[PDB]
Amino acid sequence: ARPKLYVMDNGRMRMDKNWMIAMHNPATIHNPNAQTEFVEFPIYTVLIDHPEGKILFDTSCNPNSMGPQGRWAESTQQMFPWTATEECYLHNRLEQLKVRPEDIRYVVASHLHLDHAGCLEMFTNATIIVHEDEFNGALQCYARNQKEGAYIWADIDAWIKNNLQWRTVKRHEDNILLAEGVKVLNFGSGHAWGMLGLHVELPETGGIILASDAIYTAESYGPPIKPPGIIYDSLGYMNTVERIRRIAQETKSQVWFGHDAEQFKKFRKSTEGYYE
Amino acid sequence: ARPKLYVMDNGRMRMDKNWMIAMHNPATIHNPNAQTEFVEFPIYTVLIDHPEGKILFDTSCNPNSMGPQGRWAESTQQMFPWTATEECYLHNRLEQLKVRPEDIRYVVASHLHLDHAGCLEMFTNATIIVHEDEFNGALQCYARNQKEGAYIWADIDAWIKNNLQWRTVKRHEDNILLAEGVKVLNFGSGHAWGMLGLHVELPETGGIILASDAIYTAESYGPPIKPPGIIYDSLGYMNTVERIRRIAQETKSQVWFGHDAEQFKKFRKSTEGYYE
Numbered sequence A, B: 001a002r003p004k005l006y007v008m009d010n011g012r013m014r015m016d017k018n019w020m021i022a023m024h025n026p027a028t029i030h031n032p033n034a035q036t037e038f039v040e041f042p043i044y045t046v047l048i049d050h051p052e053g054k055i056l057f058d059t060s061c062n063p064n065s066m067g068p069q070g071r072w073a074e075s076t077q078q079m080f081p082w083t084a085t086e087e088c089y090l091h092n093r094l095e096q097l098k099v100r101p102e103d104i105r106y107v108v109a110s111h112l113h114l115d116h117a118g119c120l121e122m123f124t125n126a127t128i129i130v131h132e133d134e135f136n137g138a139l140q141c142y143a144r145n146q147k148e149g150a151y152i153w154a155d156i157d158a159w160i161k162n163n164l165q166w167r168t169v170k171r172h173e174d175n176i177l178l179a180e181g182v183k184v185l186n187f188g189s190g191h192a193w194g195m196l197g198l199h200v201e202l203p204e205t206g207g208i209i210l211a212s213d214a215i216y217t218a219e220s221y222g223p224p225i226k227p228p229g230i231i232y233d234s235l236g237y238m239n240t241v242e243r244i245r246r247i248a249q250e251t252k253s254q255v256w257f258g259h260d261a262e263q264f265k266k267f268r269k270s271t272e273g274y275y276e
């Protein structure tokens, strides 16, 4: 197989840096009212144009997330504001590559947060691969009518209404070989209830690990590891980062972080090319 | 009737409220540079004067902790400053009750943080009860010559030099009946590597659970639970709080938090009386 892998720019988000890096700047006796910062970071998705079938990793935010008529709760909009030009919308990014949603064979949902699962509803022809624990957690949010937080009720509503084709990765399930040189990594609980990653082996570029929010940024990764404020299972989170580091070493893979502004700037984006 | 329980005031500590309540005041699009605050909370210990032998729960901070010639690293002193008059030192609080360190049969170390294990070195005739995972973690800090953080190298140094008599609670060990109506609760990992609590059954007052830093304050307790910034095992922490809530219900026990300023105010202090 000679795939082409694309990085698609799906806009920017801002939030308290403490969400990204827990206790990044603790107050001290002579600085008792230490103030935080509102950091900007990229939202992106990855398309693997593979001869066996197109694979999409993450889906960014829904185009109708923000605004007075937005799907996101106002509180969510104020804490995690998403800014994106029309060109940044996933459907537009795919269109400019002459890729229709119906062309996508597999969508790998790293997790079901607002900035990763926003456009799942587009892909009614794909198998949606998601960690069973993440799926269960999101569905409970829905059933419990939770309208605030990182799991968007209106998004989940749409997934169900659109009759998406789910394939859950079981808690103790081994890696899934999706296609030649493409493996779904079962990271389990950490940042969220159930994290999935991808290992891609490209002929030219070599190994890539898509970590998503298992590792927010290079600052997260270190060493030393600097865990997030947004966290479910702290032990699991630490285990996963260390696991990724080992895999990266042993397979000579690059690690692509969830939301690293510096790393993202270096990427060849879908408007400039791809990785072979 | 028989046992007398004393609450001993061991001064005050201040720190970033984010340590106490994680993400208490998140930055937003209209408050992007949200500040924290430096909150004050009590450091206290509990003496159970029991017919079978005196039991001490926690030991506060070492008198030699603060100052330019103090045991605590300057970074620690400025992040977690401890203020206490001489009358607040544990040795003095015990003296004012006509209790000598050598009279203490059991010391229960809830964990080995600087504000709980500070005076362990006093009790050379007691059995020191501590969670094995907490003990191991602290000893690693010592062996690794870690001078920063919540584990005080100089304190640990003193414990070893003073040849304390350790009794570790094993990871999967059942609760320990220390004396009639006094049980050591094995909370395991959460806030720290290994947390111990105490359930005390007093003839008159009834059930008391000493939660220590398993539950910082009533705000922590909720519901809903609001976890701390100082945390090791998030899942374990949550499990422990909910366990305490069940035990409290089933045994009709009060829950005494680790560092709740309002609750501590209400307590009958050792200088005014005791519980029976």
Ligand SMILES: [Co+2]
Pocket (backbone or CB within 6 Å): A111, A113, A191, A192, A213
């Ligand atoms: Co996330």
Ligand SMILES: [Co+2]
Pocket (backbone or CB within 6 Å): B111, B113, B191, B192, B213
């Ligand atoms: Co503590």
Ligand SMILES: [Fe+3]
Pocket (backbone or CB within 6 Å): A113, A115, A116, A213, A258, A259
């Ligand atoms: Fe994210």
Ligand SMILES: [Fe+3]
Pocket (backbone or CB within 6 Å): B113, B115, B116, B213, B258, B259
């Ligand atoms: Fe404490």
